[PDB]
Design a protein around this nucleic acid. Structure first.
Ligand SMILES: [Mg+2]
Ligand SMILES: [Mg+2]
Ligand SMILES: [Mg+2]
Ligand SMILES: [Mg+2]
Ligand SMILES: [Mg+2]
Ligand SMILES: [Mg+2]
Ligand SMILES: [Mg+2]
Ligand SMILES: [Mg+2]
Ligand SMILES: [Mg+2]
Ligand SMILES: [Mg+2]
Ligand SMILES: [Mg+2]
Ligand SMILES: [Mg+2]
Ligand SMILES: [Mg+2]
Ligand SMILES: [Mg+2]
Ligand SMILES: [Mg+2]
Ligand SMILES: [Mg+2]
Ligand SMILES: [Mg+2]
Ligand SMILES: [Mg+2]
Ligand SMILES: [Mg+2]
Ligand SMILES: [Mg+2]
Ligand SMILES: [Mg+2]
Ligand SMILES: [Mg+2]
Ligand SMILES: [Mg+2]
Ligand SMILES: [Mg+2]
Ligand SMILES: [Mg+2]
Ligand SMILES: [Mg+2]
Ligand SMILES: [Mg+2]
Ligand SMILES: [Mg+2]
Ligand SMILES: [Mg+2]
Ligand SMILES: [Mg+2]
Ligand SMILES: [Mg+2]
Ligand SMILES: [Mg+2]
Ligand SMILES: [Mg+2]
Ligand SMILES: [Mg+2]
Ligand SMILES: [Mg+2]
Ligand SMILES: [Mg+2]
Ligand SMILES: [Mg+2]
Ligand SMILES: [Mg+2]
Ligand SMILES: [Mg+2]
Ligand SMILES: [Mg+2]
Ligand SMILES: [Mg+2]
Ligand SMILES: [Mg+2]
Ligand SMILES: [Mg+2]
Lengths: 46, 271
RNA sequence: CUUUAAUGUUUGAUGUUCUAACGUUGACCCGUAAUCCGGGUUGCGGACAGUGUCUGGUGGGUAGUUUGACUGGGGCGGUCU
RNA sequence: AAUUCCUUGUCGGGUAAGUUCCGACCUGCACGAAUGGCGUAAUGAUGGCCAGGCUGUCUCCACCCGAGACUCAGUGAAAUU
RNA sequence: GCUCGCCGGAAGACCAAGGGUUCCUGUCCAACGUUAAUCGGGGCAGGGUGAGUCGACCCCUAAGGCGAGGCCGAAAGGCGUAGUCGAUGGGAAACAGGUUAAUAUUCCUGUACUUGGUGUUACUGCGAAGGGGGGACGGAGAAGGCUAUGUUGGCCGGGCGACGGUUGUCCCGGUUUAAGCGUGUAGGCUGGUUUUCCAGGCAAAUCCGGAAAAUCAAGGCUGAGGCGUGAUGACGAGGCACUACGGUGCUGAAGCAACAAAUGCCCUGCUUCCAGGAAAAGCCUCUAAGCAUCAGGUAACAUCAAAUCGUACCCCAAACCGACACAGGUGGUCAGGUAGAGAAUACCAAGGCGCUUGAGAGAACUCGGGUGAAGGAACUAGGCAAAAUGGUGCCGUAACUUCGGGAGAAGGCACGCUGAUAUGUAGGUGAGGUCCCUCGCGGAUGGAGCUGAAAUCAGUCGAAGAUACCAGCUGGCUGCAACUGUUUAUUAAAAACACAGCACUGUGCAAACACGAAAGUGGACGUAUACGGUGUGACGCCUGCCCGGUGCCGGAAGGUUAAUU
RNA sequence: AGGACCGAACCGACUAAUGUUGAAAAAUUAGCGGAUGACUUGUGGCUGGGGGUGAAAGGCCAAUCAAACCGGGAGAUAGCU
RNA sequence: CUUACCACUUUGUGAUUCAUGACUGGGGUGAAGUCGUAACAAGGUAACCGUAGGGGAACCUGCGGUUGGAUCA
């Protein structure tokens, strides 16, 4: 029946968006961790 | 009056409501309201602190005003307004000064009637007066904890407190809880028994009421798994355990009361 | 000087009243076209309350574990030198 | 009896015949009064028993209309080993 | 292209969300379509979305989030004041035709509109982050009025009919047309106004709140639709010229009336009810500091400005969530004809389709269904499943009962069509003409025309007339749970949970308790007729005896007992 | 008026059949329950793991739940295969 | 031929009576068996009425009332 994935641009962003993952310590630590690992797209490109 | 209700439904059989026809039927004095916001029982962390809470109706906060001062200025009871916030029956006042406030409206909710509240005033049901002035053995009303706190006693319907001793600068009264309490004496406390009182005759009838009343259902202990409640029980009812709140504490004894920074005031413990 | 008494006297006991730490989720002022906060005034309470270190009690609310083996399957019973 | 082991207890009822059911008895292995006792109108995709109607559920299957199965053309799996 | 079948409160159309060139044209068919494939949402090229008025920005806030200083915490950080963000909600404005292979309240034509700056003219007190008013708000129900729009006649255009009949007294098609502008009406709310005084609205206020006198009553706000203008315009069946054969120019008749409706609008209404039903800005008004022929403010008009992004397409699906061109999931809008209570259903309109393997054969067996002699639950764990029952009105209906129910109990009768009553009745609707008037979206009286039940008589065809789809099986005894509800997403819906009622017990407010090392906060902007916890679980009748053990409440005299000295 | 009655949409899942390498990692068909309410739903927010949430079944917390997932401790330990 | 009324007769469901039944309520009779002794005298606690609870059984206790209570109370 109903699936487990009801999209919503806004949510998808503020939930795992740059600023968001940039408004907290670890969250911000995350990005770094990513850039370090050398990832193409950082967080939900757009 | 109360009046039961013709059993027309498998739930509308016990619906014994209560009514006060003299209660104004219309939107309240707008310039004395202000949101309300539903807490749902959550905390700042967004975590539920106290169970049983939620749903309910929109509800808009009145204003009441337990402070009540404007000493030396009269005012006639405009109307009698039903209050969603509390159980009592708020009543619009309106002083001859032009400014109109709210009140819990006591037993003598006689509409149209006039009432003052000055320091002098006159022992009459519905008049702000510091017990230091009012007589003794009076029915009082909205008693005030501290001198200018704002009154926090007998603010419910039917409530009432009777003075007893004005020894020194501290007056001793008797809360409806049957407890002997002392106050700074130099405290105001309207007058007359709080209005309504016949409130304690409700009944609701069907869950609906309690539900749309903001009161959520409650789950018993010896009905849920152990990991959830100390009364885990399970497997053919059972119990044996000691009746304790969901946190190991005999829900029978233990006063739990441990203020101490008040004893002085408290004279004859509640009984 | 020993046994026992009065005012001095210092020290432990309870018990009073005071204020000046301390509290105040009473009222007012100022920071201010702020019910947060801070300073001030006043009222109330007052060495209590609370807190810190040590400390007796309580404490499946929580936590780490233990809870044997021979057994004509294991258990029960019995046994273990 | 959602509690009765001996149990298909015994007796009455319904049956052509009833280890179920209904009404009783009391000998309650081992009900019992807010981990409520006994009744209760209305309510229930709730448990058990009965009757009428109804019928392919059956006696005892037959026929029939279509979807596959079968034959041809095309594409073309799997488990196992 | 002609037939045939399917959907049509969708399997049509439009928008959101999500998607991201899937849109159109051209081309090519390896790989991709469960095969082929000249075809496509496949490949490759180009082409393709035009706004002052639709939307987002923006203004305003909700929940909630962030947060100077600040209050706390080993650190990181928690919280939260001013404030600042944040819609799903409140703020101003454009319609009607036409056009493209693909755009469209954007482009074109016609006709309007919103607001700011600047200027002219008349008039006048202007001025806030500040006061007030308003914005601004619930449930259910009961009409009436109106539009949508349908049916029917009139009108206009076409047609005399492959087979018996069809000049009208018949058949087919059309009959449309907006914003804005004026009128302000069916109705809805409300009495105005001048003056005086004031402990209120933190200061002020002429505004709002209060108190006073006088004066007139026919005062003022709101309001669907209708009616004219829009619009001698457009559109419009229908034609003739060209064609690419899909399309292109030109031309262009009538274009009314009656009745019937809404789940739309009047209606943020009206009636009523208890569970008592956002905020903020825009808006109008009132003054502060201040300005003081100034500046400003109001109205008319001239003009300039209205920036920037989003507009393609799918959107109940082959573009979205399900690995697929997957029988599943997906919010909102529109609402045709006959029958019908009706958004069920049946057949059809507009519109969209035949679900991407076909062709034959006509075995057992599986699947889905139709029909069955006689029997009728013998089946079987159990009537599982099937078969049956079904509509409207009227007659009639048990024990029991909390007097509401039970109850559609049960069980029955009549139902089609045709003539009559009655040339279409009852009823609904409402045109003349006449009267009077403030004087017309006036009132009255008049009842043409339009539409139109059911009933009761008599007649009549079939085996049968609630003929299809659709649409209860019923009754008796007994356990359990009062009841509606909830629950093991994906084997359990129950006798389980929940409940309304009940009892014990804690809590005097900085409440008890819960979240939190803390601050802070829920409890509650409550206050013992309140809140928390625990057990019981409507209601009726009741709820006996035991305090030895355990726990709990109270006492503290004595015995024992920590740190400390 | 009513957690009132019948019944669509809507929400929910009582029974049976079919599917069980499905059309599908819970569905399709025929019946079925509620349907003005403790209803149902769009949109966005808050609760975080020994924690939340729970009309309580150990249910749910992204097809995972008697302690989610991701990374690390970490080549855990494995008298056993 | 057909229609109307209509007897027989059929079906469904209510009311009444008689009869009858596992079992059970008490009621009446004789043996007068067992447990007591309640009431009749002040009946050895004056009795009775109503009423409520309790109990092997008469009956006891609470509440009001009656005198149809003996002693001079
Ligand atoms: Mg359980
Ligand atoms: Mg526990
Ligand atoms: Mg369990
Ligand atoms: Mg179990
Ligand atoms: Mg443990
Ligand atoms: Mg260990
Ligand atoms: Mg061993
Ligand atoms: Mg029995
Ligand atoms: Mg029991
Ligand atoms: Mg139910
Ligand atoms: Mg082949
Ligand atoms: Mg492409
Ligand atoms: Mg295309
Ligand atoms: Mg293509
Ligand atoms: Mg803003
Ligand atoms: Mg913060
Ligand atoms: Mg919005
Ligand atoms: Mg002919
Ligand atoms: Mg588009
Ligand atoms: Mg298009
Ligand atoms: Mg396909
Ligand atoms: Mg196919
Ligand atoms: Mg047969
Ligand atoms: Mg049988
Ligand atoms: Mg058999
Ligand atoms: Mg069946
Ligand atoms: Mg059937
Ligand atoms: Mg039984
Ligand atoms: Mg139930
Ligand atoms: Mg399940
Ligand atoms: Mg199930
Ligand atoms: Mg229970
Ligand atoms: Mg029970
Ligand atoms: Mg008891
Ligand atoms: Mg209902
Ligand atoms: Mg229904
Ligand atoms: Mg179904
Ligand atoms: Mg899951
Ligand atoms: Mg290691
Ligand atoms: Mg390893
Ligand atoms: Mg005697
Ligand atoms: Mg005697
Ligand atoms: Mg007596």
């Amino acid at each position: 029946m109903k699936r487990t994935f009801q999209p919503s641009v806004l949510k998808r962003n503020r939930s795992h968006g740059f600023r968001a993952r940039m408004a907290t310590k670890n969250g911000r630590q995350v990005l770094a961790r990513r850039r370090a690992k050398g990832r193409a797209r950082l967080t939900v490109s757009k | 009056a109360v009046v039961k209700c013709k059993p027309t439904s498998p739930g509308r059989r016990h619906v014994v409501k209560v009514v006060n026809p003299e209660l104004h039927k219309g939107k309240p004095f707008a310039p004395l309201l202000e949101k309300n916001s539903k807490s749902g029982g959550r905390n700042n962390n967004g975590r539920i602190t106290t169970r049983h809470i939620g749903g309910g109706h929109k509800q808009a906060y009145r204003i009441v005003d337990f402070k009540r001062n404007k000493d030396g200025i009269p005012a006639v009871v405009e109307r009698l307004e039903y209050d969603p916030n509390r159980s009592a029956n708020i009543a619009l006042v309106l002083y001859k000064d032009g400014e109109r406030r709210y009140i819990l409206a006591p037993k003598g909710l006689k509409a149209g009637d006039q009432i003052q509240s000055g320091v002098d005033a006159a022992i009459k049901p519905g008049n702000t007066l510091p017990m230091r002035n009012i007589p003794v053995g009076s029915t009082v009303h909205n008693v005030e904890m501290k001198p200018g706190k704002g009154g926090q006693l007998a603010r419910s319907a039917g409530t009432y407190v009777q003075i007893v001793a004005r020894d020194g600068a501290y007056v001793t009264l008797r809360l409806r809880s049957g407890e002997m309490r002392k106050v700074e004496a130099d405290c105001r406390a309207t007058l007359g028994e709080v209005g309504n009182a016949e409130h304690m005759l409700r009944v609701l009838g069907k869950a609906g009421a309690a539900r749309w009343r903001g009161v959520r259902p409650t789950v018993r202990g010896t009905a849920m798994n152990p990991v959830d409640h100390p009364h885990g029980g399970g497997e053919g009812r059972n119990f044996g355990k000691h009746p304790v709140t969901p946190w190991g504490v005999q829900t029978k004894g233990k006063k739990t009361r441990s203020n101490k920074r008040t004893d002085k005031f408290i004279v004859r413990r509640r009984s």
